[PDB]
Amino acid sequence: KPPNSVLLKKFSKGKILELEIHAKIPEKRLYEGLHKLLEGWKQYGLKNLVFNITNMIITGKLVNDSILFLRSTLFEIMVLPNGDGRSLIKFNKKTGSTKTLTKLATEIQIILQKEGVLD
C-alpha cells in the first residue's frame, strides 16, 4: 500500500473537506460497506454513482432544489489506510456546495457509529 499522500493523487482537482471519518476496520472492509450503503441511497438523490473499487473511490453527484438554476455538487469519496486494522474516509468536493457534501459525510458517519466501527 503506498503512503496516503500517494493515494490522494487519485482525487480530481477540488477541495478536500477538513472533516474526515476514522474507522477501526481495514480499508477494504470500510469501502465494501460504503459501496453497499451508498448504492442503497440512490433513490434519495445520490446521482451518477461510480464505484472505483480499484482505488477505493466513490464518485457521484448531489443537486440543489432548483429546477431552473441547477447547482451540482460533484464529489469523490476515498477510503485510505490509517494504520494496522484501521482506515479513514476523505471527501473531495469538485464543484458546488460544501454544506451539501458535509451533510452526506455526517449521514455516513451516523451509520458507521451505529455499526460500532468508528475509531
- Domains of the chain (ranges; CATH) run 1-119 (3.30.310.220)
Please tell me the experimental approach by which this structure was elucidated.
X-ray
Contact (Cβ atoms closer than 8 angstroms) between residue 30 and residue 50: no
Direct distance between the N- and C-terminal alpha carbons of the chain, in angstroms, rounded to an integer? 20
Alpha carbon of residue 98 to chain centroid: 13
| Helix, strand, coil % in the chain, rounded to nearest 5 | 35, 30, 35
Q: How far apart are alpha carbons 47 and 57 in whole angstroms?
A: 15
**Backbone dihedral angles phi then psi of residue 115, each to the nearest 5 degrees:** -80, -5
**Cell numbers given for 22:** 476514522
